[PDB]
Nucleic acid binder design. Structure first.
Ligand SMILES: [Mg+2]
Ligand SMILES: [Mg+2]
Ligand SMILES: [Mg+2]
Ligand SMILES: [Mg+2]
Ligand SMILES: [Mg+2]
Ligand SMILES: [Mg+2]
Ligand SMILES: [Mg+2]
Ligand SMILES: [Mg+2]
Ligand SMILES: [Mg+2]
Ligand SMILES: [Mg+2]
Ligand SMILES: [Mg+2]
Ligand SMILES: [Mg+2]
Ligand SMILES: [Mg+2]
Ligand SMILES: [Mg+2]
Ligand SMILES: [Mg+2]
Ligand SMILES: [Mg+2]
Ligand SMILES: [Mg+2]
Ligand SMILES: [Mg+2]
Ligand SMILES: [Mg+2]
Ligand SMILES: [Mg+2]
Ligand SMILES: [Mg+2]
Lengths: 147, 125, 187, 159, 225, 53
RNA sequence: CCGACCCGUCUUGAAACACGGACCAAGGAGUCUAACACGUGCGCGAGUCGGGGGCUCGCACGAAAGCCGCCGUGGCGCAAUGAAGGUGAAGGCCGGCGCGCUCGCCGGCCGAGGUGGGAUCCCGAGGCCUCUCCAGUCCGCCGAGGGCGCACCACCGGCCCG
RNA sequence: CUACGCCGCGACGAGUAGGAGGGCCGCUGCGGUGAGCCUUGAAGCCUAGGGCGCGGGCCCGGGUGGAGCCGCCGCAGGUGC
């Protein structure tokens, strides 16, 4: 909607909202990121530190699939199975724990943020963190590995 | 709901007329013909309207019944009053005040009936 | 003339909801009457929260509401939030809660009702307690938004930990000069 | 055009007073500075270490850190249109206790005693100090002496 | 039950009738007592100087403790220190006036705005005419004219000031609640001086209008309001 | 020129991009044409599966 | 009769001996795309989004609208940090044993700590009632103080990566 | 009492560059709506005609003209010299 814009209100104002002294010229200051080291150095230093230079080792032919490894924390672990699964384990007189296969749910590594409910469970994953295995062990569960 | 339907048609309505810094409303049952929640002739569970008769004598006082709200074919009860000026206004006042049927529209209905009755007597030179 | 200043005369505050939602404006009408015609300051806070923008009405999770209702002496009180109540899958035991909210996620709704709880809209709350007696006026985290990570001091100033505006995160994106002592400086 | 030297214009500011050179008196090294007490930053020039900057000379701040031979002071320095609380390390030669706060503590100590003493024994007394009131009415006696007449004196060229 | 509720209402009307009557008698007696107190102050100052002259000594009268400060210069081109002090005296417009309790703090504030004000020591008639004719009350941040005694009672009755006579006594004889009573008074918006000023740009003692005129401020007041 | 905080942007529009712009107003017509050819193929192989081997 | 210099414009300063303007009509200049950022409105909400594809008489409108769900591939978000190998966010207390060695084996509970503020909410002495009283009937209002404390701010701890 | 409504009280009102709000100011086209207007005279144009509004502008009478035009709710601009 062009009717809602400043241009419809700036009719009759000679400068069109751009000043009489300094006017609206073509490109005062260069085009794009011009002069980021000379006359826009203050803005680049103030708001984008680290912008200039190289850091680290360059690696050619980076395949993002090789390092694909999504993670899920212990607090979202029990949502990977059904609601029926958890309650059936909690009321199970037999100490038979369910199996949570996080590879099936699309995750490879289990991280250890949060806390687990007090019921054992077998967790299958490609990787675990040290605190993740510690907390799964502490509820009587087991950490097993897959490939 | 009266308030909900009002929030729909308080500005977007076919009966609305916005003109000369005025706002009128032309639905059939609007006493005073003004665009207002109090006088809207379509959104209330009970409304009252005064119209001239089919012939050029008397009025037709119409009220909304309480049961057939979503059945507009039978939703209105029309009765014709064809008496003298004083007896007519007593019937309209009794219909509204005694029945407690929308008592806030008593004087608007009486004034509208007076306008219609006076508009029916012969014009002078 | 008088020796005063007029640059602060007009107080900038919401006096009505910028929304055109009629269901919202109807209960804005209702709590405008309750605020005016009662001495309860609860109605005044609820009324002015009905004018606020969505960013000023952040969602309240289920875990946060359960935490506030667990505080001593808050039992048997109606949790009132002017905003959206949101399910949290990080909690496992939802207690019984009587709760009035502007809007509830369809999954948070099912868990509350399943636990024997009650859910009220603000028109049911007025008939429940017009003065807002026996209520706990909660709120979502106002500054829990991604914009606030960027606000504050400029990233290239000492002792500022504000997130810079970068199109990508990586070792090539704004990490060399001004970010380590080996490239210029660090501050 | 002016240089940006750290000691420009301190020719007299950091110099010693007349006939006050020599050894630093050792009581200035025996003062006890806790945290939160009010000090004035003088900045004597005998000791070149830990010197305050010339903009803090004469200013007053509150201690927050205490080290072996210095203190940290939170002192307000006005920069253009803002005031900001600088934190400066200053050796104890360049500071001293502020007598303003020391007297205010004294008035508080006298105030709490006065409140308890008067409330115990029945009556109320005034604790807020008032500004100087208008002088009261009083009779000025003559003691039998007519006041002496004074006239302006004739002008005469001195020298 | 119509009869009983009617009688209960007429009992509450009569109780209000009695309370209003009792408040009026209190206002009448307070004003009578204040008239006795004022004429005692007038006669005592005369008598004290009278007995001093019999003895051949002098009776230096007590220094004035109340002042009336009138702004005489406009708002254009004022230095920032003078502009700040005038705002502290609530004199933001030319030919505004207000009462100032006098001590060391206030007097030194008057010296700063000396070229911009004419001030002095108002007498009792000056205080009456200003409060009665030009007296407004700052009630709820509004400038509400003092047309009823209940206006003062609802905002200053907790200090005992419940009438215009109480307000005038509190202002003239500088009482404990002078600050509350004076701040309640909206600054007086006097007219131009009828008959004109001598010269606004010089001190009064050099044939002008600025600065302090001790008791000659009352002559200016009669023309100004 | 940069103005206050912002994101350092690198728009790839320095290369006369207006000569080669692909519009998709023929997208609905392309869907219809594809759907028609799928049907025609299906009739051509009468009892064989329509989606191929 | 009083007042009244020609507009536009750059300018510290224009009636200017500064520039454009003889007059009239018509046309005539912050647009669109892309990318961000913040604000607001709406839907859903730890999710969300079909935008490419496909299915529906093949098509006046309809090149629209509708549907998919084993079309959610994917994007963005839900996790950060390091150049990288890589690693990767729970604590509070009471108890018994080493040595309660500045500390390990556990139990039990509770489930993101604490201080100072903090709208709102809760308790509440004592008051406000009638033709009057000694004796309570049910709730209404004010209220000293007391309590739990949203968001947010300051600070102190705690956890993850180098 | 068109609650986006109505009413009450007090203070205040300069303005370039610039920003913001309101516009029942105006142009063109689209979706709705006015059982709208019109050869018993539309648009356009002229007018010592009558008025309204602070204003942008608008309404009405007269004349000419001879076939189309507008109000309101929204939408979109190649929208005001
Ligand atoms: Mg302008
Ligand atoms: Mg122009
Ligand atoms: Mg003015
Ligand atoms: Mg101004
Ligand atoms: Mg050295
Ligand atoms: Mg001047
Ligand atoms: Mg005269
Ligand atoms: Mg020029
Ligand atoms: Mg020049
Ligand atoms: Mg000019
Ligand atoms: Mg010249
Ligand atoms: Mg020339
Ligand atoms: Mg030129
Ligand atoms: Mg020329
Ligand atoms: Mg034109
Ligand atoms: Mg489609
Ligand atoms: Mg996926
Ligand atoms: Mg806290
Ligand atoms: Mg910390
Ligand atoms: Mg103005
Ligand atoms: Mg154009």
């Amino acid at each position: 909607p062009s009717r809602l814009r400043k241009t419809r209100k700036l009719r009759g104002h000679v400068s069109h909202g751009h000043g009489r002294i300094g006017k609206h010229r073509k490109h005062p200051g260069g085009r794009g990121n011009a002069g980021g080291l000379h006359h826009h150095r203050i803005n680049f230093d103030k708001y984008h530190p680290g912008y200039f230079g190289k850091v680290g080792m360059k690696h050619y032919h980076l395949k993002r699939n090789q390092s694909f490894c999504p993670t899920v924390n212990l607090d979202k672990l029990w949502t990977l199975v059904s609601e029926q699964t958890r309650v059936n384990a909690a009321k199970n007189k037999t100490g038979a724990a369910p199996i949570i296969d996080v590879v099936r749910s699309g995750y490879y590594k289990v991280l250890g943020k949060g806390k687990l409910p007090k019921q054992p469970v077998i967790v299958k994953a490609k990787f675990f963190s040290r605190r993740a295995e510690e907390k799964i062990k502490s509820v009587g569960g087991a950490c097993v590995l897959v490939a | 709901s009266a308030h909900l339907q009002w929030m729909v048609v308080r500005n977007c309505s076919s009966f609305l007329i916005k003109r000369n810094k005025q706002t009128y409303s032309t639905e059939p049952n609007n006493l005073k013909a003004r665009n207002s929640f109090r006088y809207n002739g379509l959104i209330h569970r009970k409304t009252v309207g005064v119209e001239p008769a089919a012939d050029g004598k008397g009025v037709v006082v119409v009220i909304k019944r309480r049961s057939g709200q979503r059945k507009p074919a039978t939703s209105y009860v029309r009765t014709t009053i064809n008496k003298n000026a004083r007896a007519t206004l007593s019937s309209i006042r009794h219909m509204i005040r005694k029945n407690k049927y929308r008592p806030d529209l008593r004087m608007a209905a009486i004034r509208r009936a007076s306008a219609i009755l006076r508009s029916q007597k012969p014009v002078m030179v | 003339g008088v020796d005063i200043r007029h640059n602060k005369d007009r107080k900038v505050r919401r006096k009505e909801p910028k929304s055109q939602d009629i269901y919202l404006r109807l209960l804005v009408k209702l709590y405008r009457f309750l605020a005016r015609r009662t001495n309860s300051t609860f109605n005044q806070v609820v009324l002015k929260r009905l004018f606020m923008s969505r960013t000023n009405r952040p969602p309240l999770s289920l875990s946060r509401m359960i935490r506030k209702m667990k505080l001593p002496g808050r039992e048997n009180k109606t949790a009132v939030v002017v905003g959206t109540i949101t399910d949290d899958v990080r909690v496992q035991e939802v207690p019984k809660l009587k709760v009035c909210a502007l809007r509830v996620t369809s999954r948070a709704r099912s868990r509350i009702l399943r636990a024997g709880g009650k859910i009220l809209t603000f028109d049911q709350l007025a008939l429940d307690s017009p003065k807002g007696c026996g209520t706990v006026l909660l709120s979502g985290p106002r500054k829990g938004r991604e914009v606030y990570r960027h606000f504050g001091k400029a990233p290239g100033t000492p002792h500022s930990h504000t997130k810079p505006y970068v199109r990508s995160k990586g070792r090539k994106f704004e990490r060399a000069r001004g970010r380590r002592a080996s490239r210029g400086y660090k501050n | 055009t002016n240089t940006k030297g750290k000691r420009r214009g301190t020719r007299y500011m950091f110099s010693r007073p007349f006939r006050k050179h020599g050894v630093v008196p050792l009581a200035t090294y025996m003062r006890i500075y806790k945290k939160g007490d009010i000090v004035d930053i003088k900045g004597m020039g005998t000791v070149q270490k830990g010197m305050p900057h010339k903009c803090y000379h004469g200013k007053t701040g509150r201690v927050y850190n205490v080290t072996q031979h210095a203190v940290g002071i939170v002192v307000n320095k006005q920069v253009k249109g803002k005031i900001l609380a600088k934190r400066i390390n200053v050796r104890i030669e360049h500071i001293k206790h502020s007598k303003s706060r020391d007297s205010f503590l004294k008035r508080v100590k006298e105030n709490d005693q006065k409140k308890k003493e008067a409330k115990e024994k029945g009556t109320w007394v005034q604790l807020k100090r008032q500004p100087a009131p208008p002088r009261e009415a009083h009779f000025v006696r003559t003691n039998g002496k007519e006041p002496e007449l004074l006239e302006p004196i004739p002008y005469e060229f001195m020298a | 039950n119509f009869a009983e509720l009617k009688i209960k209402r007429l009992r509450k009307k009569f109780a209000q009738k009695m309370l209003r009557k009792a408040r009026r008698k209190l206002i009448y007696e307070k004003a009578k007592h204040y008239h006795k107190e004022y004429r005692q102050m007038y006669r005592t100052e005369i008598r004290m100087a009278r007995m001093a002259r019999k003895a051949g000594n002098f009776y230096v009268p007590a220094e004035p403790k109340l002042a009336f400060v009138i702004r005489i210069r406009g708002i254009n081109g004022v230095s920032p220190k003078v502009r700040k002090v005038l705002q502290l005296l609530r004199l933001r417009q030319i030919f505004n006036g207000t009462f100032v309790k006098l001590n060391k703090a206030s007097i030194n504030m008057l010296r700063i705005v000396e070229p911009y004000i004419a001030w002095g020591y108002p007498n009792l008639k000056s205080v009456n005419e200003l409060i009665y004719k030009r007296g407004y009350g700052k009630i709820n941040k509004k400038r509400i004219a003092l047309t009823d005694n209940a206006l003062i009672a609802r905002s200053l009755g907790k200090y005992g000031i419940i009438c215009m006579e109480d307000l005038i006594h509190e202002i003239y004889t500088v009482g404990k609640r002078f600050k509350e009573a004076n701040n309640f008074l909206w600054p007086f918006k006097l007219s131009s001086p009828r008959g004109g000023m001598k010269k606004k740009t010089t001190h009064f003692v050099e044939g002008g209008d600025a600065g302090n005129r001790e008791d000659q401020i009352n002559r200016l007041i009669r023309r100004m309001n | 020129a940069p103005s206050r905080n912002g994101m350092v942007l690198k728009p790839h529009f320095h290369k006369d991009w207006q000569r080669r712009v692909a519009t998709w107003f023929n997208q609905p017509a392309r869907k219809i044409r594809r759907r028609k050819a799928r049907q025609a193929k299906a009739r051509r192989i009468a009892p064989r599966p329509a989606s191929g081997p």
